[model samples]
Target: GLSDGEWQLVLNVWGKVEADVAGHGQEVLIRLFKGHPETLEKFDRFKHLKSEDEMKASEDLKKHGNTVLTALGGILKKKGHHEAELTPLAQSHATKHKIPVKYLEFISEAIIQVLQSKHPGDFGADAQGAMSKALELFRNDMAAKYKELGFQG
Candidate 1:
């Protein structure tokens, strides 16, 4: 569904941010948790983290953040080939962590914010919307498996 040009745009944007995965990923978590505070309750490890700065400083947060960004980088490298990889992750999080599928939207939004903040004027409206659609594609794929895993929420 994405054009080669658009994919290149994704790469350009991703390249700058991936250089500091910890920082960029931390911003994603910060925006996500602040915008949807209840999401923090889902992560017992991060539940007590109060501010964005605090979250960014936490070793646990840094590790998890890196995991997410690294996963994103992998997906981009594979041209968004995430089904095999993300399916099991979705299942595990749904069954074990009990993270609600709805929270994916927050994460998606946070990612967009990170792009805008980190690479100002690089992401146009069209690029942002297309990139968001791409993210939703990934999120939907993951969410599709949640029901089969018997996620109550």
Candidate 2:
């Protein structure tokens, strides 16, 4: 969990991206797929997208990306106290979606990369580090839920 100062830093930076959440969400997914191509296969909605143009133009991709960012925003708003929120997400992804837990880290890194690139001046080392810690806490909470649900991934 993040301290009050760290939470403020993360929220301040997130506010900038939240202005265009859909576009920023898509950018984060694009960065994720570019960095780890295998993770793209997990998304059945837009896995067929090969070119960057196709990905950018995809409505399904945009919608799903928006969902992802929105979920993150929910967690951030809770200041990392997200057990009630994360449980259902963890259960669905683990049992129904069957998504591996490792992709959470990849997505976190992708988000950090997108933020750093978009707001280079504001998202310096301190902000990046704060966000990283917050996301790690999010991942850990999800992982705990997965374990409780008997999903070993």
Candidate 3:
């Protein structure tokens, strides 16, 4: 979905975030949970966190957040060929994990928010636009899988 130029810009920006995957990923999750508290219930390990402090100090949150970012990294590395990783991820989340598609949107927004906050200079309008489109494309891919699996929003 992204042009070569756009993909390059996005990857360049992602490199900055990837430098500290665990920390930045945790920040993204923190922001996501803070904005959409309902999303927390979806995570068995995170559901027990009763306060912002608890979440901030959670190793499980850090680990899962790292996993989320790593998955995104894998997809990005594939450029436009996301089917290999995306399909299985979508299948699990759609059926076994029971994740609503809207949560993907929330997480996408959270990722952008975290990137912008962490690297305001690197994530300029061009990079932000590229990254946003890339994320939207991934979300749509997952949404289609969710539909195929009969996992309505």
What lDDT score belongs to each candidate, Candidate 1 first? 0.80, 0.87, 0.90
Off by over 4 Å in 3: none
Candidate 3 residues 1-153, lDDT tens each?
Answer: 799999999889889978899998899999989999999888887888888799888998899889999999999888879899898999889888888888999999999999889889999989999999999999899998888887885
- Top candidate on TM-score is 3
lDDT of 2 by residue, 1-153 (tens): 578999999999989978999999899988989899998887787789997889888898888889989988987888977778888899888998887779888988899999988899999889988999998998888888888888884
Superposed Cα deviation of residue 56, candidate 1 (Å): 3.5
lDDT of 1 by residue, 1-153 (tens): 667777777777777877799888777888888899998998889988988778877998877888888887777666667667777688778878877777887898889988988777878876786688778877777777886776654
Error of 2 at 29 (Å): 0.9
What shift in Å separates residue 139 of candidate 2 from its native position after superposition?
Answer: 0.8
What's the candidate order when arranged by decreasing TM-score? 3, 2, 1
**Candidate 2: TM-score?**
0.95
Q: For every model shown, what is its TM-score relative to the native structure?
A: 0.88, 0.95, 0.96
Which of candidates 1 and 3 is the stronger one according to lDDT?
3
- Show model 2 residue runs off by greater than 4 Å: none
